[PDB]
Amino acid sequence: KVFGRCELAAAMKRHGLDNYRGYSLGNWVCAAKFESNFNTQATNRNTDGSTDYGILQINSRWWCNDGRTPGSRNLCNIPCSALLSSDITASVNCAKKIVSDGNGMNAWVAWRNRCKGTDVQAWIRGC
Amino acid sequence: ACPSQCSCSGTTVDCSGKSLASVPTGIPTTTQVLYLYDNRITKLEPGVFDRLTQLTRLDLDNNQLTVLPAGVFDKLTQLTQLSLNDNQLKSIPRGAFDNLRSLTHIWLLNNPWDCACSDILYLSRWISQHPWLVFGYLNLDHDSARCSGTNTPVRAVTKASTSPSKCPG
């Protein structure tokens, strides 16, 4: 599923990401835009053997299990394929695991560069 | 001969998640992958890896190391991946990474890197010179190795910000 911006914003509010660790809703919408363009089936093969999955391009070395990354840790305890679903629940919970403190979204370099510092609530307006 | 505390498939030796306090003895010299992550290793003996010249991946992350011995990675010329993250390291000794000619990925984050001290300069300069090498928990991020307290990138630290006065001993 490729989400619309509004449709994505609503689903993320529903799964409680608004102000999660201080981060307001547009932040999470903005990050997903740059990671995957709102496409839940987005997939990227890495040179280390891992792969990135879903709307926020969550990694199979650290976070999820795809059965094809050796020494992976599955810190979120989901199959990577649960991150490709049309239902964003698993992606959100895994984004919640990654964001440990009030600085945890620094994890998404494209977020840090293209999103942080701007008026992110624009991504939430019009809906 | 695979070590008692460890599972061993081909040239992979896995000592991860086994409540270990030290690096097992008897790791075969032909090992290529060595998982030691998620343990309670607090120190490494000088030369612990010296005979393990076929290593391509070494995971040392999520232990409790405070310091690394000098020369510890010098023999590891085929090593492509190194995780050091989530330990208690304040610096990296002068030249730790110099013999690592096959390196493509290093993980450094979640260490209390001490950027007030002179000892940090090797690392800050190394990362400046190797912007394709440093990964956080997603992809490439040469800002992911961060100063304790300030949370600013280690790579950015210059002599002007440091003093020998603030190093241990």
Domains of chain B plus CATH, in order, are 1-169 (3.80.10.10)
Residue A115's CATH number? 1.10.530.10
Could you give the angle at the alpha carbon of B116 between the alpha carbons of B115 and B118, nearest 5°? 85
- Residues B73, B49: contact at Cβ < 8 Å? yes
Resolution in A: 2.4
CA–CA distance, B114 with B149 (Å, rounded to integer): 9
Q: What is the C-alpha to C-alpha distance for residues A7 and B156, in angstroms, rounded to an integer? A: 40
The alpha carbon of residue A1 is apart from the nearest alpha carbon of chain B, in Å, by 22
The answer to whether A17 touches A97, Cβ cutoff 8 Å, is no
Please give the helix or strand (H or E) that residue A103 lies within, else none: none
- Determine the Cα angle at B74 with ends B71 and B77, to 5°: 170
| Experimental technique used to determine this entry | X-ray
Chain B: residue whose CA lies nearest to A62:
B137
In whole angstroms, give the CA distance from residue B110 to residue B132: 19
CA distances from A81 to A28, A84, B27 (A): 21, 5, 35
**CA distances (Å), origin B145, targets A71, A101, B131:** 22, 16, 12
Among residues B42, B47, B9, B10, which one has the least CA distance to residue B25?
B47
State which H helix or E strand residue B35 sits in. strand B33-35
Of B35, B138, B139, the CB nearest to A71: B35
Whether residue B97 contacts residue B122, with contact meaning beta carbons closer than 8 Å, is answered with no
Length of chain B as a residue count: 169
The secondary structure of chain B in percent helix, strand, coil, rounded to multiples of 5, reads 10, 15, 70
- Can you list the alpha helix ranges (DSSP code H) found in A15-127? 25-36, 89-98, 109-114
Q: Does A111 contact chain B (CB < 8 Å)?
A: no
The answer to whether the CB of B103 falls within 8 A of the CB of B84 is no
- As annotated, the binding site of A for substrate includes 101
Q: How many domains does chain A have?
A: 1
Q: Which chain A residues have a beta carbon less than 8 Å from that of B151?
A: 103
Which residue has tokens 């001290």?
A: B117
Query: How would you list the strands of the sheet with B7-9, edge to edge?
Result: B7-9, B12-14, B33-35, B57-59, B81-83, B105-107, B134-135
Residue ranges making up the domain that contains A117: 1-127
What's the rounded Cα separation, in Å, for the pair A64 and A95?
A: 11
Among B139, B146, B152, B155, the strongest candidate for a mutation testing the A interface, having the largest count of A CBs within 10 A, is: B139
